[PDB]
Design a protein around this ligand. Structure first.
Ligand SMILES: COc1ccc([C@H]2OC(=O)NC2=O)c(OC)c1
Ligand SMILES: [Zn+2]
Length: 258
């Protein structure tokens, strides 16, 4: 597969290799704040990242992934809409060429400058590859980024980016604390959806935080210096690595808050 985000291989083309692109629970979606309903049954959300062990950062040609040791329950997400225990495996971002776009989810059609995805898998399926074949296999925590004041907890990530400019490059990235990327509030919207890139599997419980985090223009500018291409290939800046909003179909978005 040669999928990407260009005119010739971007989201509008994905359905030819990945027909589930036109399925019934595709992501991202627009979150219409006037139609999402508060759900009193949602249990409290539990983000337990104190024992998180980051290992590595990888430019995969689509984004950069900060990977974690998920061989044990070190950093987990529970509660909210979730049954059981979901283990953190990696986080990454989607961002724009300009500050007015870059997020995958939208809020009343608003596009944020970027969106962080913290990806976790359901430990009852044993491994991540099995989990992505299940409707409740993954829980993705999605956090919007707006451009304003710098996020101090992001700066170790931005500073390593020069070392992984091109596709296939990785770097050691130990001791990074993902709690520094969270907003103050854990108020969220939740709905059933999918992976937002190929293979587009319909295996995700989406948990999208209402409160965005602020990053500086300098921080996001450094994201935009990455490359989709590999070393020694023609330079294509890693920008606009987001899929647009997909049809909601037969789904309800629930709010954790009133
Ligand atoms: C192999 O594991 C994957 C594959 C794709 C996605 C895409 O779905 C998403 O929401 N962002 C993505 O890059 C993923 O993240 C959950 C994890
Ligand atoms: Zn993502």
């Amino acid at each position: 597969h040669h999928w990407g985000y260009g005119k010739h291989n971007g989201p509008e083309h994905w359905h030819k290799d990945f027909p589930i692109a036109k399925g019934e629970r595709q992501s991202p979606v627009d979150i219409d704040t006037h139609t999402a309903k508060y759900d009193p049954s949602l249990k409290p959300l539990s983000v337990s990242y104190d024992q998180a062990t980051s290992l590595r950062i990888l430019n995969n040609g689509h984004a950069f992934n900060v990977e974690f040791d998920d061989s044990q329950d070190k950093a987990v997400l529970k509660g909210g809409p979730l049954d059981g225990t979901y283990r953190l495996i990696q986080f990454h971002f989607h961002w724009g060429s300009l500050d007015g776009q870059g997020s995958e989810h939208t809020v009343d059609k608003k596009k944020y400058a970027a969106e962080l995805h913290l990806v976790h898998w359901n430990t009852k399926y044993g491994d991540f590859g099995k989990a992505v074949q299940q409707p409740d296999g993954l829980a993705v925590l999605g956090i919007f980024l707006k451009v304003g004041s710098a996020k101090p907890g992001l700066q170790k990530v931005v500073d390593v980016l020069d070392s992984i400019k091109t596709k296939g490059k990785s770097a050691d990235f130990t001791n990074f604390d993902p709690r520094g990327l969270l907003p103050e509030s854990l108020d969220y919207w939740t709905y059933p959806g999918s992976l937002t890139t190929p293979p587009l599997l319909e295996c995700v419980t989406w948990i999208v935080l209402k409160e965005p985090i602020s990053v500086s223009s300098e921080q996001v500018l450094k994201f935009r210096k990455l490359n989709f291409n590999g070393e020694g290939e023609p330079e294509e800046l890693m920008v606009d690595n987001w899929r647009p909003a997909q049809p909601l179909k037969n789904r309800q978005i629930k709010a954790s808050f009133k």
